[PDB]
């Protein structure tokens, strides 16, 4: 049950975020590894440089390229994926 809280990317790039995060959740138990999976995939499919944060409790402030930002809920975790550089 994905829930988009704040998206800036295209409906297509947005679908790839959810899907990609889904596979990582089906595979990894540790947030850091889930974050890595998603980051590495986006660096590949959409070129560097991306950054990913996964967790249940945190606040952040970042600088990103417009149309390249997404914050959403998947499972009981929240994912912040964005490109800068």
């Amino acid at each position: 049950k994905a829930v988009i809280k704040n998206a800036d990317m295209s409906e297509e790039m947005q679908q790839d975020s959810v899907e990609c995060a889904t596979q990582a959740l089906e595979k990894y138990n540790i947030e850091k590894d889930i974050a890595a999976h998603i980051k590495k995939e986006f660096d590949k499919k959409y070129n560097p440089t991306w950054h990913c944060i996964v967790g249940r409790n945190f606040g952040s402030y970042v600088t990103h390229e417009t149309k390249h930002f997404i914050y959403f809920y998947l499972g009981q975790v929240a994912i912040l994926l964005f490109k800068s550089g």
Binding site: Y61, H64, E65, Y73, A78, F82, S84
Partner: peptide
């Protein structure tokens, strides 16, 4: 090229 500064708070 066209940057934005965004903050997010997570408490689920």
């Amino acid at each position: 090229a066209e940057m934005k500064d965004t903050g997010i708070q997570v408490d689920r």
